[PDB]
DNA sequence: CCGACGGCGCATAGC
DNA sequence: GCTTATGCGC
DNA sequence: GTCGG
């Protein structure tokens, strides 16, 4: 169902969304908002009335109310109010540089720092991660088309394994399902030499050729388990640049490695799904393990796992091949 | 009625 | 200098 | 803001 159908509703709730996230600081209210949005960009109908969305499980009654008045008006007043205020839409926009939140946003703001412009003229003023923010601000609003990760899965991958045959590196998220575009690359690495109760050069190692090879430009955050940086594809010497990506690289132990690629590949649908029914099955699933949960539901010690589908095996489920995980 | 709503790796005041 | 809390992104 | 114990 496109946006013809409640395009004008979605978009409403997700600027509320938004706006209760960077402006109120209420991250609730904005999941809540996300939620009924999701779940209304499913429905198969344009909606008529406020009281028929209120049936959808996160659509409630304020919501509905203002569902009735924007379908009367074409207009939410609440929105329309925010949008001319000029502190609600520049804490909101600064808020799009990755790195500045809405702490940071409405410092800037109450300085009188609102534009990326006001933002370039203080670089003395922001941390790394924010500068890199600045940099790439346009590209990281780019999504990525599928063409593209399966190129840089290609590099990453063929890096890794230079360094040591014995590296996995999974890309997952919503592009390990089958998806036609990306919003970043997401890799989960893991070497069978580090597990749960056991080096400090794991990561960096595979971070430095993928830096000598000129793939990673820039580093956001590094530690020994979690790398956050900015990537881009080779571009020909003849031909435009490609846009620089966001690239995530997480080291798992080997131990809860399928539990994390399982996790990281999703859908949060799909995992509130298997996660559900593994419950009412007497096991509990976390992004790290599955437990046996006991009669009384102590869960016991984690279960050896070797690949996703022994975790379909203990729950006594048929593999769900990653295209067919959207819930 | 009223608390839960995800929780953790990394970068960055107070002692 | 060392520890903790908090912002941030995921 | 919605939900459910
Ligand atoms: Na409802
Ligand atoms: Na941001
Ligand atoms: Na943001």
Same mark, same amino acid.
Request: proline share 0%; charged share 35%.
């Given at each position: 169902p496109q946006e013809t159908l409640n395009? /004008?509703?979605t978009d409403m709730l997700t600027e509320l969304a938004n706006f209760e996230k960077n402006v109120s600081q209420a991250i609730h209210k904005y999941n809540a908002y996300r939620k009924a949005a999701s779940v209304i960009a499913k429905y198969p109908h344009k909606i008529? +009335? /406020? @009281?028929? @969305?209120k049936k959808l499980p996160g659509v409630g009654?304020?919501? @509905?109310?203002?569902?009735d008045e924007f379908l009367a008006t074409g207009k939410l007043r609440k929105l329309e109010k925010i949008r001319q205020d000029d502190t609600s839409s520049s804490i909101n926009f600064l808020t799009r540089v990755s790195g500045i939140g809405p702490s940071a946003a409405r410092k800037f703001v109450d300085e009188g720092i609102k534009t990326l412009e006001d933002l370039r003229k203080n670089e003395d003023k922001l941390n790394h991660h924010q500068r890199i923010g600045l940099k790439y601000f346009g590209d990281f609003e780019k999504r990525i088309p599928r063409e593209e990760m399966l190129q840089m899965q290609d590099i990453v991958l063929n890096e890794v394994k230079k360094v040591? +045959?014995?590296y996995i590196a999974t890309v997952c998220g919503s592009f390990r399902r089958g998806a036609? +575009? +990306?919003?970043?690359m997401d890799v989960l690495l893991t070497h069978p030499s580090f597990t749960s109760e056991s080096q400090p050069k794991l990561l960096h190692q595979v971070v430095e050729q993928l830096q000598k090879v000129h793939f990673i430009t820039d580093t956001l955050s590094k530690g020994e388990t979690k790398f956050m /940086?900015?990537?881009q594809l080779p571009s020909k010497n003849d031909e435009k640049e490609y846009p620089h990506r966001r690239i995530d690289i997480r080291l798992i132990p080997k131990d809860q490695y399928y539990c994390g690629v399982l996790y990281f590949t999703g859908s949060d649908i799909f995992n509130k799904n298997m996660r559900a029914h593994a419950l009412e099955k007497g096991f509990t699933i976390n992004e790290y393990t599955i437990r046996p949960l006991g009669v009384t539901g102590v869960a016991g010690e984690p279960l050896p796992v070797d690949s996703e589908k022994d975790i379909f095996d203990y729950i006594q489920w048929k593999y769900r091949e990653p295209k067919d995980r959207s819930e």
């Open positions: 395009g /004008g509703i008529k +009335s /406020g @009281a028929e @969305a009654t304020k919501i @509905a109310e203002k569902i040591d +045959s014995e036609e +575009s +990306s919003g970043d /940086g900015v990537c």
